[PDB]
């Protein structure tokens, strides 16, 4: 298993247990759990320190908010400090309060800022009332006057461009100036109420001719805003004091650390008599030496000179699971853990997944050039790892791309391979060491001459075996198929058969792997009435199809093209138990008895998984002296789920054929009408136009097939791993480790 024992208790209360738990947290190899009573959060032995810490965090949050509004960057590259537990910390927080207090008075000086605007708005009336209204409410405002003034008054408007700041919050808002000519005082009061609803506070009452009041107002605003820029020395002082952000970000780290320490020490027992302040810990086995070394360090920092240790104990709880990853397995373990967390000692699926995932991808993405591009990107990203890791990047997509380094590498390698095996290389085969199909000089023997005069309008099928034809290409698909107009038929047959065969072995792998999972856990019932019926059912139902496909491949020659038996109809008759006297010859002699026995064993599989094991559970419960109906319901659910998932999964494995054929068609389509036009008769303009055309080809094949169809195949293979493969051996339940390590 991952661990042998994980519930040892080696912690005892001391007068400086804070330092012990702090150093243990520094170790970052433990998790804490206690407080079964689940007492309220405000009945705690250490509530006052948590409240103090919360106050420090609130003050700190306020100052960092103010700093970030100053747009002053903070640098955090120093060391990780050690928390000063003795009362010195108290003095420190005292200083911090002073800092906050300064900020308070600075906001009091922002009262002055409001006064400034009470004059800048005044400047906008440089030109029987006048005032200032929010622009966004200009229409509705006008509406009101038309209904209350009843059109007996008149008004005019003026606009400002630069936004005016908000004194309280600091947000920018837009405004406008208005001037109303009235005919009575009752209307002045009515529009005074409306303007109280619209905030037209200011009022430059006319006294003198235009020039005199204009210049008086100008001199007034000039003195006012001059005094404001003179009072901006307070903003200067604010910046000078804010410059000390570096001296307090370290304190932020320290404050979070001590807060975590006190929060975790709160979990200890609810008693202190005889120094019974104890907290239970999950810790692995390979790291006990560092843990007791940490305890020795904690006692060293303490002046009490006590062992501060306790004896081992064991209970029957559920331990958490931790996958100990290294530079290589991490990228693939994180991919599987994203869907479900393994139980205590679940058969780890990363060791097999790490390879069978890019293989299925390459079956889905079997092209040479694209694979080469992917492996080149992998080489680039692997070789430059050190610099990129020590670098800040705004592209989160690139971060999650960079996570799957060896994923993309192995994916590209197997993609190159499967490009070689199909003899697919940018949708065209590579005739390497010979073709064996078309030999026209030999074809003239079989009454094949002069037809090509009508060849200008016919197709003239090639037969199999006029005497020297056929023959196996030693490696991959014969290149001639790439140019044949009926290539789709043979390609469809071959790809469908390969996909179905691949899918059946994947599933049997799943169930054989499950047999390991059950035998370790000492569950004889599960092996005896579990694995066996399901494996027999899977085999009898589809290993027969695999073997039949291979028999048909290795049995029937070219001359038997008449009445060549069809396997799919035989499978429909396998399901429907129908035997017509004619219409389909037997593939091999004696099929009746074997096929009938296959049907009968397939039928006999299902009841074995329904009645026997709930009844044996009932018998064990009777021997003990368990809702029987609920157990029957669960067993029926399990059996029906498995039996229907059989057909559903074998049918869903056709995605391999589907996407492989779609990929081949897409690549051929790109070849057909992007670069085909690039080759022509022009003696001089060939390379010039082809340069543009191939540039476009490169961009388009990068955009669509390189990153995208790769993603679709990637996620489809992930799904095939999550459901069709994993659910047959993978419980997918339990906890995940939550270490005590800090940031």
């Amino acid at each position: 298993r991952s661990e042998e024992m994980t519930l040892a208790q080696l912690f005892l209360q001391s007068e400086a247990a804070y330092c012990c738990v702090s150093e243990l947290g520094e170790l970052g190899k433990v998790q804490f759990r206690d407080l079964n009573p689940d007492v309220n959060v405000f009945q705690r032995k250490f509530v006052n320190e948590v409240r103090r810490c919360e106050e420090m965090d609130r003050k700190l949050r306020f100052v960092e908010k103010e700093i970030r509004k100053a747009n002053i960057p903070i640098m955090d590259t120093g060391e990780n400090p050690e928390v000063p537990f003795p009362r010195d910390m108290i003095d420190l927080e005292a200083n911090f309060e002073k800092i906050e207090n300064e900020l308070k008075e600075i906001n009091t000086n922002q009262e002055a800022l409001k006064r400034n605007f009470l004059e800048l708005t005044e400047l906008k009336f440089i030109l029987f009332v006048a005032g200032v209204i929010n622009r966004e409410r200009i229409p509705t405002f006008e509406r009101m006057l038309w209904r209350v003034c009843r059109g007996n008054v008149f008004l005019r408007q003026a606009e400002i461009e630069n936004p005016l700041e908000d004194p309280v919050t600091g947000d920018y808002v837009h405004k406008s100036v208005f001037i109303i000519f009235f005919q009575g005082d009752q209307l002045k009061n009515r529009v005074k109420k409306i303007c109280e609803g619209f905030r037209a506070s200011l009022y430059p009452c006319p006294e003198t001719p235009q020039e005199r009041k204009e210049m008086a107002s100008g001199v007034n605003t000039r003195i006012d805003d001059l005094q404001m820029v003179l009072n901006q020395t307070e903003d200067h002082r604010q910046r000078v004091l804010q410059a000390a952000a570096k001296n307090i970000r370290v304190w932020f780290i320290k404050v979070r650390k001590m807060k975590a320490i006190y929060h975790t020490l709160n979990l200890c027992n609810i008693d202190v008599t005889q120094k019974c302040l104890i907290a239970e810990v999950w810790c692995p086995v390979t790291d006990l030496d560092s843990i007791q070394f940490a305890l020795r360090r904690g006692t060293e920092h303490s002046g009490s000179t006590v062992p501060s240790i306790l004896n081992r104990m064991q209970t029957n709880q559920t331990p958490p699971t931790y996958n100990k990853t290294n530079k290589f397995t991490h990228g693939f373990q994180n991919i599987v853990d994203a869907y479900g967390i393994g139980t205590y000692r679940e058969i780890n699926p990363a060791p097999y997944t790490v390879i069978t995932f890019p293989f299925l991808f390459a079956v889905m993405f079997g092209d040479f050039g694209h694979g080469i591009l992917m492996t080149l990107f992998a080489v680039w990203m692997v070789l430059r790892e050190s610099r990129i890791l020590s670098q800040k990047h705004e592209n989160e997509m690139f971060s999650m791309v960079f996570s799957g380094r060896y994923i993309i590498l192995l994916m590209g390698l197997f993609s190159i391979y499967t490009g070689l095996i199909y003899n697919d290389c940018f949708s065209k085969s590579l005739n390497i060491f010979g073709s064996s199909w078309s030999v026209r000089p030999m074809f003239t023997q079989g009454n094949w001459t002069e037809e090509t005069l009508l060849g200008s309008s016919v197709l003239q099928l090639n037969p199999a075996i006029p005497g020297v034809f056929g023959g196996p290409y030693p490696f991959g698909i014969d290149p001639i198929w790439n140019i044949a107009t009926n290539k789709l038929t043979f390609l469809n047959s071959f790809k469908m058969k390969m996909s179905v065969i691949l899918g059946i072995i994947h599933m049997l792998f799943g169930v054989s792997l499950s047999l390991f999972n059950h035998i370790y856990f000492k569950k004889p019932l599960n092996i005896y009435f579990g694995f066996i019926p399901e494996i027999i059912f899977m085999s009898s139902l589809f290993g027969y199809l695999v073997i039949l496909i291979f028999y048909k491949w290795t049995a029937y020659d070219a001359h038997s093209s008449r009445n060549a038996p069809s396997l799919l109809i035989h499978f429909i008759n396998m399901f429907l138990f129908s035997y017509p006297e004619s219409g389909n010859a037997m593939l091999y002699s004696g099929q009746k008895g074997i096929q009938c026995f296959l049907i009968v064993v397939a039928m006999l599989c299902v009841p074995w998984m329904l009645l026997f094991k709930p009844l044996i559970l009932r018998h064990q419960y009777l021997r003990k002296k368990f809702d029987f109906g609920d157990t029957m319901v669960h067993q029926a659910i399990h059996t029906i789920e498995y039996c229907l998932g059989c057909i559903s999964n074998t049918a869903s494995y056709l995605r391999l054929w589907a996407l492989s054929l779609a990929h081949a068609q897409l690549s051929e389509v790109l070849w057909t009408m992007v670069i085909h036009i690039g080759l022509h008769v022009r003696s001089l303009a060939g390379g010039l136009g082809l340069f543009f055309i191939f540039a476009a080809f490169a961009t388009l094949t990068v955009a669509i097939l390189l990153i995208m169809e790769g993603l679709s195949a990637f996620l489809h293979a992930l799904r095939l791993h999550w459901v069709e493969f994993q659910n047959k051996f993978y419980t997918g339940t339990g906890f995940k480790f939550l270490p005590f390590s800090f940031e």
Partner: protein, 350 residues
């Protein structure tokens, strides 16, 4: 092959998922059981930190008082409601505007009574609910005759759609404001019922009983509280709603009542209000009738949530959320005064 089964999600699935997610954020009974055990407002703050009502009081509220908690909870409510409304489509937008017209009416009535108390002008603003706020909320102070009120409200607030014709007077006083309230309320309720039954489907099924009960409760309250007034019996008949099951009762028995026993006899023929009145002993040692009204409203609202294609679960959600706010602030007020007379009189929602 009907409305709610096959194209309900295209415009409502995300929002309904969000609402039913936020339903679980409403505090439960055990939360109350442990929240009534606080010693001071700081403990209430902390126990709210431990649940979904946490991380909304990170201000420098050293002199914490229950008014601050009330303000912050109301702010949270309006924030969530504005969120839910802005992401909505058009029929649902009509639904939510129909909901908020009630609080808009409340604010209009509040400012109308404020005009009579001329001594307060600006202080009315913090008293008004920001949920029911609109562009021309504070303009109501201008009017001094109801025709002027219709002139102010006709402009851009659709509230005029409920009293453009229904108010005819030119002498605003402190006694007719209740007439304005009742007329607006009955018009709003009738319009809402008609719109809900026009929408059809499960929305009509969900919203018809609630508005029915609402109209009947308004009828009962107005019948009980009309005693000792200048209004005549025919005018009391004029203000009854016609959306309840008390439509013949509205002129047949309630309109000729003379005492409380008569109202009890009216209620006696319908079990739903008869049990409600019998349980409402109205004694000093027992809960009043208003408490039973609130509890029945809460029960029906809780029932209203269970409907997969409820185009109007937002009504139940907002009513329940207001009720949680009231429960929390009342318990905090009781705790702040250092007395335990009425801590165990909280209506147990969820």
């Amino acid at each position: 092959s009907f409305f709610p089964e096959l194209y309900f999600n295209v415009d409502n699935g995300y929002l309904e998922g969000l609402v039913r997610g936020l339903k679980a954020g409403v505090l439960s009974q055990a939360d109350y059981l442990n929240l009534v055990q606080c010693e001071t407002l700081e403990d209430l703050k902390l126990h709210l930190q431990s649940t979904d009502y946490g991380n909304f009081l990170a201000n420098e509220a050293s002199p914490l008082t229950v008014s601050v908690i009330d303000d912050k909870l109301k702010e949270k409510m309006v924030v969530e409601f504005r969120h839910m409304r802005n992401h909505a489509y058009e029929p649902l937008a009509s639904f939510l505007d129909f909901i908020t017209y009630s609080y808009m009416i409340d604010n209009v009535i509040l400012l109308i009574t404020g005009t009579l108390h001329q001594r307060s002008i600006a202080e009315l603003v913090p008293k008004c609910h920001p949920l029911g706020s609109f562009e021309q909320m504070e303009a109501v102070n201008i009017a001094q005759t109801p025709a002027e009120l219709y002139n102010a409200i006709l402009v851009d607030t659709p509230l005029a759609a409920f009293f453009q014709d229904c108010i005819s007077e030119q002498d605003l006083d402190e006694m007719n404001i209740e007439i304005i309230r009742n007329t607006l309320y009955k018009a709003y309720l009738e319009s809402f019922y008609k719109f809900c039954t026009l929408l059809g489907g499960t929305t009509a099924d969900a919203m018809c009983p609630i508005l029915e009960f609402e109209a009947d409760r308004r009828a009962f309250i107005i019948t009980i509280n009309s005693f000792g007034t200048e209004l005549s019996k025919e005018d009391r008949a004029k203000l009854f709603p016609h959306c309840g099951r008390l439509y013949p009762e509205g002129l047949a028995q309630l309109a000729r009542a003379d005492d409380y026993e008569q109202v009890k006899n009216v209620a006696d023929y319908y079990p739903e209000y008869k049990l409600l009145f019998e349980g409402a002993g109205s004694n000093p040692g027992d809960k009043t009738l208003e408490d039973r009204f609130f509890e029945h409203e809460v029960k029906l609202n809780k029932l209203a949530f269970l409907n997969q294609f409820h185009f109007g679960v937002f009504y139940a959600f907002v009513k329940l959320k207001e009720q949680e706010c009231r429960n929390i602030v009342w318990i905090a007020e009781c705790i702040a005064q250092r007395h335990r007379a009425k801590i165990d009189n909280y209506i147990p929602i969820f």
